[PDB]
Amino acid sequence: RAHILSVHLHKLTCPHCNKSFQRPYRLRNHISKHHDPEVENPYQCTFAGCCKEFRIWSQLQSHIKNDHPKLKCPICSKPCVGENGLQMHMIIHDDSLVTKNWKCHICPDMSFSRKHDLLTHYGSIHTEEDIPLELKYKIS
DNA sequence: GTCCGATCAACTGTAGTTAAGCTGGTAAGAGCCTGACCGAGTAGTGTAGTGGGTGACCATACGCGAAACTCAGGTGCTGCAATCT
Ligand SMILES: [Zn+2]
Ligand SMILES: [Zn+2]
Ligand SMILES: [Zn+2]
Ligand SMILES: [Zn+2]
């Protein structure tokens, strides 16, 4: 895989000056300046569904760090991008919309009908230690 | 939808606030490439299980031949009798 990407598919080289760069990111920045079109805003947001464009690389660095920070779900630690990403993923845990089933983390048999009732099993066969966070998190 | 016409400022007459860069010695933006660090990507891998087809060995079958066994053919004398003498 490395041989193909270093002897035949020269993807890390400039299309114009024939320098090369240690990551595609720096090649992109290089093309955006040293071989740039007459465009006023040489930088464009690299992320999903974002259409914004910028004059100086520092403003793009700021925009990525502000509006596309890479987060982990507070409950399930799965990664997501930006405020919308977190708010979209938080629906999955929501007990008002997602009228989910109720089970033990270990015991195969459980089949509760309400959240308060599920805490009886975790309060007796387990205890207040090693209950799952989605059950515990009365955060709203 | 349109009608009147009041009315913030559109577009119209002159009176007074903004850089650029010179002498310098200088630290300030905006920056570059090698390097390091973790997350994720490319993708062949590591046990583990379902199926199939090959191979060996058997026995079952007929069909031709091989020897078996049963029952009746065949040899040869002579005890007894009859033809020729
Ligand atoms: Zn180049
Ligand atoms: Zn963006
Ligand atoms: Zn979550
Ligand atoms: Zn249990």
UniProtKB/Swiss-Prot annotation:
A zinc finger (C2H2-type) spans 12-35, 43-68, 71-93, 102-126. It comes from the Eukaryota. It is found in: Nucleus. Interacts with the internal control region (ICR) of approximately 50 bases within the 5S RNA genes, is required for correct transcription of these genes by RNA polymerase III. Also binds the transcribed 5S RNA's. Present with 1380 molecules/cell in log phase SD medium. This is Transcription factor IIIA. The chain holds residues 152 to 291 of 429 of the full protein.
